[PDB]
């Protein structure tokens, strides 16, 4: 491990990220589209490019950096899913990029180096548009051909021909720069020929002029007879155009100032078939003929503002080239996203600077010209250059051909390296290699897609592809940024100084507005496959780690979620009752108390979790069977009573010892169960053995040892049934000093049912005698008033120097004559539980007095908290 | 509940999904498309329509078809999301199709029945487009305000004017389609004023000729003066095109014949500002003026085929109103259906049989006339009617007006519900209502946005926002009913006779591709809010029900995967390991082995689910903390090691109880674990206390009696920690007559791991002295190769006569000798554990023989199956 940042990370970005969009049609862009709008579309695209380059250097900050390329890295910190449909993204965009380099490639050979290096010439002026696709389909799979072979048998030769090529663009660049440093004293000499408001082409005749003067005399040139086809001045059988307008040469590079500058600060588009056109320039108007329209210059593709972004995007794609060697780098956590970072930066720099300058340089008329038909078959970038332009011809055409080199090795790797991960069936025999480890069937599919797209034969049409598939692998990754900050993934901490979710989202938003804008069935398609890529990956990732079945993609999100569900920190405010079902089995293995059932079912009303529990008697070893019925038979008890929730029956010697097994061992980790439900112990006085009872009162323990709130519900057989309706009543809730967090909730959760929405709270807290509750009652009142739920509120004891809950027994029936005097006609009576016994020896005197303190009652509902469960909403 | 089926569901739904479209913009649509594409365009709206009614006769069929409107249908049914959602956009829906509703009778009214009853008349041809506009949005607005006034006060009176409506749809449809008839004998005279190839407007001028005869001479027409700005005859400064053709009377209804049909059978579109034109009429070619144009017919709107359908596809809509008697019906499970997809039916044979009639009747040139500019300003449907075009005007705008009252009616009746539901808060407030039930402030709300729709004031921009929100609902429910039929969701048994999840795929497909082709960014919008409340809704009903924190959408995610969990029947094939790690703690509440840790991490490395359980011997009321603490340190242990799973810690009074009510407590319904993982018990013979090894074998017979595979592996200091990796060796695995399933298995899971993937399974069979495996051994190959996992595989034993596991000393022995000899240097050894103690007596001997066949290895991993445990793959 040993690699510097410049060397490591800043060269290899830089020289991937420049390309041939730069030499080919950025001149264009700012001829087509003004400088404000080139301007306005750099930034976008730069700022698309930023936020994710900062995206992907919070993915580089986390984790260890594992060695290996970049799609190890994106696999590795946003898991198995996400990284196979980004690496096939990328490998698409990869194969495309490849076969639009070797396009701009051919073009630079056929239409500015060799023009004879031509197989099937575009003979006459019909059917010109399909010789040029011919020979670029011909040219593209001889390239191609060739290319694979070279990247076959040897690489390390490509190796350094890569930065061979870096110095080949760097030095392009200067000497763009410097010509247009010189262009600020003395320009260059190339004139460009205008007849009346549009422009000809200077490739076919000589001099620019209507009559010229030889042999001591006056006679028409070969303009004059290549547009009106009369070698006499004396016809008239041509273009009323060419007689009513009259002839100029304007200089091609007037130089740098500010008229120049404001002449074309404006945008002008041009739809196909029209003629690029001067603006400042006085013309008649006249009609014109068919055999002269060829011997012009016309806009050759439609121009809109969406298809020049299309164009334009591939020419800052290139960000996650800043990874290959991220085993290698000296210091991963910091080379990386500081070098792209800075990369970028110098790229839209040098973009914003090098379109000004365009601006500032060249007319409206070079500028709009493909090409370069109007300035002599002569590339316009170069004009500008200070040797010559063939400098810059030779650079472009080296670079490209590199670039296409890059890509065409590069490609490969990334799919051996995915299908060698084994994620999806078939690129394991698209996978195999050779003995070093090159590829060896992979490149055939390769060359075969690369292939397929050079058929198009088109350096504008394949454009569109490319940006659809960097902008998707762009999206996704945003996206997977921004859920897994925002929704507490585990193993997710990028600890890098300036990222924010926020930008993430924006970036993500952003550049998905352009992918769509862009061309919608294009980014619709890509959408499609990328989703089902995803949702396939999902599905056998669930076969193999699961039982292999339809029910295994549940699983797994069943186990994702618990897992999130560890990071958060318990417990914060707004206390919710989860419910877990203490029942007792009949001798002949049958339920007795189903009213309890239909009891909790009402009272979360399919809310929330409710596990059932119980314990059978007897060694686990011989009842297997008994448990297996059991749980079947409380299953189907549960199916009618409209309560929805999970079963767990524990076969144990000791009753009392399974029900503290099951107290704090149902659920898994964080989906665990907040509150617990027992019944009452009937008859207890007729049952001479203790243990009818104590085993109840050792439970109330355990609840009041693990911190659980507890319920315990008297005479649940005079309970409602789910079917029986109510029209009228009152819900009293007899609060007291302690626990009234949730006695003023549990009235609004039940409420929330066809059985009870009827009746109304009656909240009747006592006012003891030690201070009076004039104030006090206005101030519940108006905390009742400010929450949602809000009834009749009063004050009202009999005494209060009986210490009853302080820290004992004529306090008991001193309030029951109160309670039963002011509340024995109200449907149901929440009231707060006591506190257990003091030590082991007062249970039975508190058997002897909580009944005396129900004395009378209907229906009552004790509870106690015994922990902390604070409410905020509503309550 | 006492209601028919022709009464209850056909007729309502027949009344509402008729409109206006079918009367103002059919004989356009037909005229401008042609024949083939309008079939098209039909067929392919009627195909949508009817997959969604299956889907929702699917969703009629299950449950108990709650009562009251449609909403609450599809709320029960699809959950509380998924109802919001299309429950707003059937909203949306219904108060833009009332704005549309009163703009079609604002243009009947205006163009046909009184044109002076106008506002801002448009003088002069400059600017006419605008005057239209405002009147239609003055008069838009007062009729607005009137008809909410109309329908806030009394309500019946609507009531029985839906079936007036009914009945004049049904009177104008029969009068239609008797005039179609009638025109087969004798024609009505309609004459039509032709100029050359284009058509001239009758509304203006009287009679269609080049010259009159009036005073017994010759006199320039009308015509003459009006096209040509000169009353005298012999004047020459008009259009060159009027000198230059014809002028003609053709028939406006030539009859019901097949050349009529031929003739516009093929498609014709236009483009805005162009003039429609008889196809086989002679004519010459001049240039004209720009005054002429004005007394010409004109194109209003540029006509595409996407556009069409976007235009008509309103015309269709209304499904689902054959579900707002629902808590009527005498029979809801089988009328709603069958009277549903009759009705769809039945409209979709008049459409088409109305779309051949007025191609088969009717010239392409009136039929591409809207508002009726080319015959007497009058109604093109009108033309053919028997009595008189004015039953049919009468009849539609009686109609149209109704149609804006019942949609005015009936958004508000579907907001309130909404609002009462309690899924969004701020319709809470939106929800207010009177005395008896009528709502009172959400009434001013969809008031307000049909005046923003009428504010557009444009039938044909209007439309596809209804055809927007419509299709955003279909694809919501064909959505739905495709995942839930798929996903085997519980509480969804769609008993419907000719119920497929394909065909609610296909329509899913097939009307996102229509609502997708229609317009792109409205249907991105669209999408975005249905997937923002979606969200929104979700995360309000995760607060509501959970603690009400950003981790409760996990909670809830967790336990409905759960609940999807229970459906399916247990087990397929496919077995995979489940792991439960048993651990004992130090006295000092430390750990012991963190090696089987290790252990367990490489062995599923990361897969599946891994619950590590401890047992601490002591009261529970007074150990609480020694549990917390236990629990935490396990969890940080956990973390080092590189297992992800869960932990559970339970105080008990006896170590082996413990251990046994950890066996089967651990997980939640379907969450379950599948094996036992337990350590080798470490100098017996040094115990003097048979508790310290009996508790071991006590707790396999538990593990034999839960029917749960045993690992048992000893030696576990020996094993290498997940740091040391391994070059070079050999995993020994010595199957022997049972448990084959898995043995096999175990390398395959356990190699793809960074320390054991160096190594080679040694396949090891035992070769029986009964009968050699000469074809055995092939036949063993051929599976293995036929599977993924293959290695060397050989056929070896020493005897066959001692019987050690076939129900027995010696043989132990005589295999330990054989074993040691042939794999004394392997890495590993997998071994198959014998059978339990026959009896409780038969325990001690046990242990003594089990280790001599181990002794003398370094490490064996003991394993028993005890289960089922099928597997296909790999293995
Ligand atoms: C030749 O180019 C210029 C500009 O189009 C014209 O030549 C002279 O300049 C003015 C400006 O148009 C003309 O109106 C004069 O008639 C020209 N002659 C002078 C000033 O002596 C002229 O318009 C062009 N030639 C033709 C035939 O159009
Ligand atoms: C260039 O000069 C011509 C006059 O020779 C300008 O006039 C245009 O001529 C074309 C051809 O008939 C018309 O279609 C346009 O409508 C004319 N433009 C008008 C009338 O504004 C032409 O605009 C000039 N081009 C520029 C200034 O870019
Ligand atoms: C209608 O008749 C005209 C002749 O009066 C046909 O000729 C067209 O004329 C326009 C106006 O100049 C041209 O733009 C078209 O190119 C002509 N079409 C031809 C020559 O085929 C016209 O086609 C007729 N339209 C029909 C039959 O639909
Ligand atoms: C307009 O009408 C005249 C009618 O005279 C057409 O002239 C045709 O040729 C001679 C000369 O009048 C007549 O005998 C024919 O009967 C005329 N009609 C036909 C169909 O041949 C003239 O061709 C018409 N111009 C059009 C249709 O553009
Ligand atoms: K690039
Ligand atoms: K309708």
């Not at 003995?435 to 490149?443: I, M, R, S």
Request: charge should be neutral.
């Amino acid at each position: 491990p040993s690699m510097g940042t410049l060397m490591g990370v800043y060269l290899p970005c830089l020289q991937n990220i420049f390309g041939v969009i730069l030499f080919l049609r950025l001149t264009w862009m700012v001829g087509t589209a003004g400088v404000l709008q080139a301007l306005l579309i750099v930034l976008i695209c730069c700022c698309c490019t930023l936020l994710t380059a900062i995206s992907m250097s919070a993915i580089a900050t986390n984790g260890v950096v594992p060695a290996g390329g970049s799609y190890f890295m994106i696999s590795r910190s946003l898991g198995p899913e996400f990284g196979g449909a980004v690496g096939l993204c990328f490998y698409l965009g990869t194969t495309f990029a490849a076969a639009m380099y070797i396009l701009g490639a051919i073009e630079i050979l056929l239409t500015y180096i060799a023009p004879p290096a031509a197989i099937f010439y575009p003979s006459g002026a019909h059917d010109t548009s399909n010789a040029t696709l011919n020979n670029m389909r011909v040219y593209g799979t001889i390239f191609l051909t060739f290319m694979t072979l070279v990247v076959f048998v040897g690489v390390k030769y490509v190796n350094k021909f890569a930065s061979l090529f870096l110095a080949c663009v760097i030095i392009s660049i200067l000497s763009i720069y410097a010509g247009g440093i010189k262009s600020i004293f003395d320009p260059p000499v190339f004139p460009v020929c205008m007849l009346g408001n549009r422009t000809l082409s200077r490739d076919q005749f000589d001099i620019c002029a209507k009559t010229a003067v030889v042999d001591n005399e006056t006679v028409a040139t070969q303009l004059w007879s290549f547009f009106c086809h009369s070698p006499n001045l004396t016809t008239d059988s041509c273009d009323p155009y060419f007689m009513l307008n009259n002839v100029t040469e304007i200089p091609g590079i007037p130089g740098a100032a500010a008229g120049v500058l404001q002449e074309n600060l404006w945008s002008a588009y041009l739809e196909k078939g029209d003629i690029v056109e001067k603006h400042g320039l006085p013309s008649a108007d006249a009609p014109s003929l068919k055999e002269s329209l060829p011997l012009y210059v016309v806009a050759d593709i439609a121009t809109s503002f969406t298809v020049l972004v299309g164009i334009f995007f591939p020419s800052v794609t290139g960000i996650m080239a800043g990874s290959n060697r991220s085993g290698d780098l000296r210091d991963a956590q910091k080379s990386i996203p500081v070098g792209t970072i800075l990369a970028i930066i110098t790229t839209s720099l040098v973009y914003f600077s090098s379109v000004v300058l365009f601006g500032a340089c060249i007319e409206g008329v070079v500028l709009r010209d493909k090409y370069g038909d109007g300035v002599s078959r002569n590339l316009v970038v170069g004009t500008l250059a200070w040797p010559s332009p063939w400098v810059i011809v030779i650079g472009s055409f080296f670079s490209t051909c590199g670039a296409g080199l890059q890509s065409l090795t590069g490609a490969p790797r990334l799919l051996q390296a995915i299908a060698k991960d084994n994620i999806i069936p078939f690129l394991r025999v698209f996978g195999h290699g050779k003995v070093n480890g090159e590829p060896t069937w992979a490149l055939l599919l390769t060359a075969l897609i690369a292939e397929l797209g050079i058929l198009i034969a088109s350096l504008d049409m394949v454009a569109p592809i490319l940006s659809m598939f960097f902008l998707m692998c762009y999206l996704f990754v945003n996206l997977a940024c921004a859920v897994q900050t925002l929704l507490r993934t585990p193993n997710w901490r990028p600890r890098f100084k300036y990222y924010h979710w926020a930008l993430s989202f924006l970036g993500m938003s952003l550049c998905l507005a352009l992918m769509f804008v862009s061309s919608w069935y294009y980014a619709l398609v890509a959408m499609l496959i990328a989703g089902m890529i995803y949702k396939y990956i999902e599905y056998q990732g669930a076969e193999k780690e699961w039982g292999d079945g339809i029910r295994g993609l549940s699983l797994s999100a069943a186990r994702y979620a618990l897992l999130r569900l560890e990071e958060g920190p318990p417990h914060t405010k707004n206390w919710r009752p989860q419910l877990l079902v203490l029942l007792k089995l009949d001798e002949d293995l049958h339920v007795k108390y189903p009213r309890l059932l239909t009891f909790a079912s009402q009272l979360k009303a399919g809310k929330g979790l409710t596990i059932v529990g119980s314990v059978i008697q007897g060694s686990f070893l011989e009842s297997y069977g008994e448990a297996q019925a059991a749980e079947q038979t409380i299953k189907n008890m549960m199916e009618i009573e409209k309560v929805k929730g999970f079963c767990q029956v524990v076969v144990a010697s000791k009753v009392r010892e399974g029900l503290a097994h099951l107290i704090q061992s149902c659920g898994l980790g964080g989906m665990r169960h907040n509150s617990v439900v027992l019944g009452w112990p009937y008859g207890w006085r007729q049952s001479e053995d203790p243990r009818a009872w104590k085993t109840f009162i050792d439970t109330v323990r355990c609840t009041t040892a693990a911190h659980l709130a507890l319920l315990v519900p008297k005479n649940i057989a005079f309970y409602p049934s789910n079917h029986e309706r109510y029209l009228e009543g009152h819900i009293d809730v007899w609060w007291i000093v302690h626990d009234g967090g949730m006695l003023m909730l549990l009235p609004f959760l039940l409420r929330q049912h066809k059985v009870w929405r009827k009746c109304r709270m009656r909240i009747f807290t006592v006012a003891q005698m030690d201070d009076n509750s004039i104030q006090m009652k206005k101030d519940l009142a108006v905390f009742l008033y400010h929450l949602r739920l809000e009834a009749e509120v009063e004050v009202v004891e009999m005494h209060n120097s009986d210490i009853s809950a302080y820290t004992r027994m004529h306090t008991a029936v001193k309030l029951n004559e109160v309670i039963v005097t002011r509340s024995h006609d109200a449907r149901l009576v929440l009231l707060n539980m006591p506190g257990p016994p003091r030590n082991s020896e007062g249970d039975e005197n508190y058997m002897e007095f909580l009944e005396v303190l129900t004395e009378g009652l209907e229906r009552v509902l004790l509870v106690r908290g015994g922990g902390r469960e604070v409410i905020t909403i509503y309550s």
